Design an enzyme around this catalytic site. Sequence first.
Site, PDB file in Angstrom:
ATOM      1  N   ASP A  16       1.887   2.279   5.343  1.00  0.00           N
ATOM      2  CA  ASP A  16       2.953   1.411   4.857  1.00  0.00           C
ATOM      3  C   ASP A  16       4.190   2.100   4.295  1.00  0.00           C
ATOM      4  O   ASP A  16       4.995   1.461   3.606  1.00  0.00           O
ATOM      5  CB  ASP A  16       2.390   0.342   3.928  1.00  0.00           C
ATOM      6  CG  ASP A  16       1.488   0.915   2.893  1.00  0.00           C
ATOM      7  OD1 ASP A  16       1.888   1.913   2.286  1.00  0.00           O
ATOM      8  OD2 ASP A  16       0.402   0.380   2.694  1.00  0.00           O
ATOM      9  N   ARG A  30       8.947   1.681   1.508  1.00  0.00           N
ATOM     10  CA  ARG A  30       7.627   1.096   1.342  1.00  0.00           C
ATOM     11  C   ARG A  30       7.722  -0.335   1.905  1.00  0.00           C
ATOM     12  O   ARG A  30       8.645  -1.091   1.554  1.00  0.00           O
ATOM     13  CB  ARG A  30       7.268   1.034  -0.138  1.00  0.00           C
ATOM     14  CG  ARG A  30       5.967   0.274  -0.459  1.00  0.00           C
ATOM     15  CD  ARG A  30       4.697   1.001   0.050  1.00  0.00           C
ATOM     16  NE  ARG A  30       3.441   0.469  -0.501  1.00  0.00           N
ATOM     17  CZ  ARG A  30       2.785  -0.604  -0.052  1.00  0.00           C
ATOM     18  NH1 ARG A  30       3.272  -1.350   0.942  1.00  0.00           N
ATOM     19  NH2 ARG A  30       1.631  -0.948  -0.624  1.00  0.00           N
ATOM     20  N   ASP A  35      -0.594  -4.563   1.181  1.00  0.00           N
ATOM     21  CA  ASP A  35      -1.368  -3.500   0.509  1.00  0.00           C
ATOM     22  C   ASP A  35      -2.817  -3.479   0.955  1.00  0.00           C
ATOM     23  O   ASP A  35      -3.206  -4.214   1.880  1.00  0.00           O
ATOM     24  CB  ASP A  35      -1.225  -3.543  -1.038  1.00  0.00           C
ATOM     25  CG  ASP A  35      -1.817  -4.787  -1.681  1.00  0.00           C
ATOM     26  OD1 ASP A  35      -2.322  -5.704  -0.998  1.00  0.00           O
ATOM     27  OD2 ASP A  35      -1.775  -4.843  -2.930  1.00  0.00           O
ATOM     28  N   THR A  36      -3.619  -2.683   0.258  1.00  0.00           N
ATOM     29  CA  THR A  36      -5.001  -2.470   0.673  1.00  0.00           C
ATOM     30  C   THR A  36      -5.970  -3.003  -0.367  1.00  0.00           C
ATOM     31  O   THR A  36      -5.728  -2.885  -1.583  1.00  0.00           O
ATOM     32  CB  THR A  36      -5.334  -0.985   0.918  1.00  0.00           C
ATOM     33  OG1 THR A  36      -5.412  -0.306  -0.336  1.00  0.00           O
ATOM     34  CG2 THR A  36      -4.285  -0.318   1.801  1.00  0.00           C
TER      35      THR A  36
END
EC number: 3.1.31.1
Length: 132
Positions: A16, A30, A35-36
């Site tokens: 990302d 970014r 997100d993760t």
Amino acid sequence: KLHKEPATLIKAIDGDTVKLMYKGQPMTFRLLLVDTPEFNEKYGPEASAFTKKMVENAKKIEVEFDKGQRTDKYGRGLAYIYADGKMVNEALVRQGLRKVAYVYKGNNTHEQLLRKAEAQAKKEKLNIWSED
């Protein structure tokens, strides 16, 4: 109110983050709203290779800032990134390689679009959604 601006790939960094030339200056971007999952930090390499392929093979890269804060506390630009018109942020979520993130400082324009992509990855049990 959002607009796409031209940019040029310097380096794909990971899933990302990408380094781009933007208006003559190199900067790290970014990807907004992705997100993760905490403690499902796998798919890291797969997400890196996916983003890398997408940006490296694109004729055109575009940056689209949202209406909120344009940089994070790390100094990274915060944007939606498009490779030949296809949003990288959306593609990662659609593949179950990223979940939709919490909104940072008013940057929510494509939040419902990304939530729609996430719903479909989840229905299909893709990658981060494979375990229920």
